[PDB]
């Protein structure tokens, strides 16, 4: 909520907490489905880990369109002020 | 002295009817015989949840009518006084005020329960 860089750092920290994500291949502009090779269920539990960290309810129509950490940190910048 | 001997005897052979009920039978305990009893199935939550007393106003008013039976209780002694009309007036005054309290709890729906 203070800096966008701290939010992006917390996003990448939550993403490297999860087991199936390779921390090398993970980037700001990595695609979850076609680059990392994730199912939908992996992406949805990623978004619920984001809900557990940041502490707000993320609906489904705007978590359908979270295919990269760029859009993740941008949508979290949408839900807050920064 | 004899009262303490009696109370100590009662407590002694009331706790020696307990400890001979544990060490005498055979204890084969495993972690299903010690689970709570909810008529055969698993309990829903714990048993330490707040069991809401609907009878709470009567539960308080028991105290204020139990102080009454600390005030009304010296009447077998107060019959022995040489100032007897005042004693009669004060005793009937206390039961009259107790009954006015009971009637105010009656008519304002206090002896009934909530919900």
């Amino acid at each position: 909520p203070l800096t966008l860089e701290g939010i992006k750092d917390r996003v990448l920290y939550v993403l490297k907490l999860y087991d199936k994500i390779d921390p090398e291949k993970l980037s700001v502009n990595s695609h979850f489905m076609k680059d990392l090779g994730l199912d939908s269920l992996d992406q949805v539990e990623i978004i619920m880990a984001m809900e557990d960290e940041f502490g707000f309810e993320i609906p489904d129509i705007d978590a359908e369109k979270l295919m990269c950490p760029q859009e993740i940190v941008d949508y979290i910048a949408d839900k807050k002020d920064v | 002295m004899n009262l303490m001997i009696t109370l100590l005897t009662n407590f002694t052979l009331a706790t020696l009817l307990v400890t001979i009920a544990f060490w005498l039978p055979q204890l084969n305990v495993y972690s299903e015989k010690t689970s709570p009893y909810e008529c055969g199935f698993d309990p829903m939550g714990s048993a330490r949840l707040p069991f809401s007393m609907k009878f709470f106003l009567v539960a308080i008013t028991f105290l204020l009518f139990d102080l009454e039976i600390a005030l009304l209780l010296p009447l077998p002694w107060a019959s022995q006084t040489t100032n007897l009309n005042t004693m009669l007036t004060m005793a009937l005054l206390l039961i009259f005020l107790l009954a006015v309290s009971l009637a105010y709890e009656w008519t304002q729906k206090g002896l009934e329960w909530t919900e």
């Binding site: - | 305990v29 495993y30 972690s31 010690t34």
Partner: protein, 185 residues
């Protein structure tokens, strides 16, 4: 048994823990006696406890396998432990107070004849003292649970299943993800 029956499948389970055992039920039922006595704080003897379903599946696969005739199997668990951090893990799964003390050989074999003065089922004895404070020897040449198609299940995945019985009430609603696993050796 080996010399009078030349094909007797001899099986060596190392130390078996389970529900009706005398291994974790012994380590958990010295809590209100006075403080879990050991010799030199129990950091001198080494154990590897084997799980009872693994031993039973080993006995099944010993019945099934004709190759397993006449062998001498040594069933051991996958993780070796000191006794001290084993008893740390026992009193840390049960969420119990823990103040161990050294009781030397001057009087810890005499607490047998002090503590089986009853003719009933004994709580401890001097053989139990000499076996709990005996390390588990390593015999790599013998075939084990790996050589009968059994995945050996370690202590931490079943110790909560064993020792949920001893928690009072205040941490019965606890988890396996609360206690950190004991140090291996």
């Amino acid at each position: 048994v080996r010399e009078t029956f030349p094909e007797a499948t001899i099986i060596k389970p190392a130390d078996i823990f389970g529900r009706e055992d005398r291994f974790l039920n012994y380590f958990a039922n010295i809590r209100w006696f006075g403080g879990v006595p050991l010799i030199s704080l129990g950091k001198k003897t080494v154990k590897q406890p084997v799980y009872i379903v693994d031993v039973t599946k080993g006995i099944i696969n010993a019945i099934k396998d004709p190759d397993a005739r006449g062998k001498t199997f040594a069933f051991v668990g996958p993780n070796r432990y000191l006794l001290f951090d084993l008893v740390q893990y026992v009193f840390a799964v049960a969420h119990r107070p823990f103040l161990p003390y050294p009781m030397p050989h001057f009087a810890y074999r005499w607490i047998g004849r002090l503590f089986e003065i009853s003719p009933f089922e004994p709580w401890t004895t001097r053989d139990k003292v000499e076996r709990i404070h005996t390390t588990d020897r390593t015999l790599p040449h013998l075939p084990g649970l790996e050589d009968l198609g059994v995945q050996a299940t370690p202590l931490e995945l079943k110790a909560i299943e064993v020792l949920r019985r001893h928690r009072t009430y205040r941490w019965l609603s606890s988890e396996i993800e609360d206690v950190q696993p004991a140090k291996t050796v």
